[PDB]
Amino acid sequence: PGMKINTTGGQIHGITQDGLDIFLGIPYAEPPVHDNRFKHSTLKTQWSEPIDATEIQPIPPQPDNKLEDFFSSQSTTFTEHEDCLYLNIWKQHNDQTKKPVIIYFYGGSFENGHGTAELYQPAHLVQNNDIIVITCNYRLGALGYLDWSYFNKDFHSNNGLSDQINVIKWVHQFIESFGGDANNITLMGQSAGSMSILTLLKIPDIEPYFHKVVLLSGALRLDTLESARNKAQHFQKMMLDYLDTDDVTSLSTNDILMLMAKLKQSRGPSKGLDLIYAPIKTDYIQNNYPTTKPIFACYTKDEGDIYITSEQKKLSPQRFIDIMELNDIPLKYEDVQTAKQQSLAITHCYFKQPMKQFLQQLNIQDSNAQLWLAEFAWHDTSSAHYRSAYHILDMVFWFGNLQILAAHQYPTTAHLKFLSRQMQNDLANFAKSGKMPWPMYHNERRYYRTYQ
């Protein structure tokens, strides 16, 4: 049952099951604890004992993900410790080499998410396509994206973003030992995972380590250094007010989680649209994107509907406007009264139009750019829980985790199995060939695939 992989760093022990080699909880970087707490992570390239890759390892400390239960099909509890920099690898058990590699970055407002969530476990996808799929944890929350240098000149902002760099460098260094093609790395991301890839594209150090990107339902809204400073300022106020210290190093993990919860409570509700924690624009992030990599972008047809699920659960009109303003979306009071108005405004201003503009500018910048757009539009209005094509829902299909719908009174049907299986194939074939089976997106026709 055990499966041994030899690297230049040492051995790695996963499991062989049901035609797959599965490796869980590979530490890719030093644990960001003790003297490494609050700093950019250090890549792990050497271990003096074999790495036991048979168990899920801890996930970044985080508030309760209200949406995790919805996007899973059974009761689970994951351990959360600051020692959480782990990645997981799914691959077919055979002797083929130079396999296309997909690294997945989850979303979750840079607050929750983890590489071992049911929604991101790609077993069904690797079962039907001989690719290598990797998920990971990156630091989240204050611990990931507070500007800690506000408190200490040896501490860093953008820590979670440094963690994502180290996932790519580790794959670059070792994935060939698993049959992967280190010359053919696809980064795939959803929401904040998509925003993270948009950011890695503009970091020249890391940019040449990957070769294709898949962007689901996300655009780039980097925080500014001055905004991060003010949020660090208010974090220090929560520190003083509730705990009576200014020593961040004395803070316990639970202390930071409580302080973040106060900070969000004082900024007001946002349904995750207020990016309290986010990558910050710095000197090593450049202004413009490269165009050498094939890009597949996708949004869902009714993004907003999972942000604004009912007239009773909408945001207050003036709060909503404030949110969208911190996201450079100007809107008026009369146009955001109703649930339906806010859902649509999220769908159009927060996702559709920014992504369209990202693709159009890349075309203008480069005549040979390889871009595809898709709209995920599956839904069933007669259902209880899948009434429109909202944010995140397409990931159920991309990874073939249809069991999630069946746990929420939508049984699997022939159409669902076919549509998901096609999407899996489109995704895996994109990783292989850099092309989609429909016309490229160009600025005159704006062709897109509508999945349903």
Q: Are 236 and 216 in contact (CB under 8 A)?
A: no
Method: X-ray
Q: Are 281 and 224 in contact (CB under 8 A)?
A: yes
What is the distance between the alpha carbons of residues 72 and 70, in angstroms, rounded to a whole number?
A: 6
Nearest to 66 by CA among 398, 410, 392: 392
72: CATH: 3.40.50.1820
For residue 181, what are the domain limits? Answer: 2-226+278-451
If DSSP states are collapsed to H, E and C, what string results for the chain? Answer: CEEEEECCCCEEEEEEECCEEEEEEEECECCCCHHHCCCCCCECCCCCCCEECECCCCECCCCCCHHHHHCCCCCCCCCECCCCCEEEEEEECCCCCCEEEEEEECCCCCCCCCCCCHHHCCHHHHHHCCCEEEEECCCCHHHHHCCHHHCCCCCCCCHHHHHHHHHHHHHHHHHHHHCEEEEEEEEEEECHHHHHHHHHHCCCCCHHHCCEEEEECCCCCCECHHHHHHHHHHHHHHHHHHHCCCCHHHCCHHHHHHHHHHHHHHHCCCCCCCCCCCCECCCCCCCCCCCCCCEEEEEECCHHHHCCCCHHHCCCHHHHHHHHHHCCCCCCHHHCCCHHHHHHHHHHHHHHHHHHHHHHHHHHHCCCCCEEEEEECCCCCCCCCCCCCCCCHHHHHHCCCCHHHHCCCCCCCHHHHHHHHHHHHHHHHHHHHCCCCCCCCCCCCCCCEEEC
- Angle subtended at Cα 205 by Cα 291 and Cα 276, rounded to the nearest 5 degrees: 85
Tokens of 275: 């990016």
- Residue 203, domain member (yes or no): yes
Residue type, 358: F
Q: Are 343 and 418 in contact (CB under 8 A)?
A: no
Under the phi-then-psi rule, with left for phi > 0, alpha for psi from -120 to 50, and beta for the rest, what region is 20? beta
What backbone torsions phi and psi does residue 191 show, to the nearest 5 degrees? Answer: 60, -125
Give residues preceding each break in the chain, C–N over 2.5 A.
none
- Residue 268, domain member (yes or no): no
Rounded alpha-carbon distances, angstroms, from residue 102 to 88, 116, 175, 188, 398: 12, 15, 11, 7, 12
Rounded alpha-carbon distances, angstroms, from residue 447 to 111, 370, 427: 34, 13, 18
Residue type, 127: Q
Q: Are 145 and 278 in contact (CB under 8 A)?
A: yes
What is the distance between the alpha carbons of residues 260 and 110, in angstroms, rounded to a whole number?
A: 12
Total tally of structural domains belonging to the chain:
1
Q: Are 139 and 32 in contact (CB under 8 A)?
A: yes
What is the distance between the alpha carbons of residues 445 and 383, in angstroms, rounded to a whole number?
A: 34
Tokens of 176: 């060939």
- Residue 249, domain member (yes or no): no
Under the phi-then-psi rule, with left for phi > 0, alpha for psi from -120 to 50, and beta for the rest, what region is 158? left
**What residues have CB less than 8 Å from 243, skipping those under 6 apart?**
251, 255, 259
- Angle subtended at Cα 42 by Cα 153 and Cα 178, rounded to the nearest 5 degrees: 160
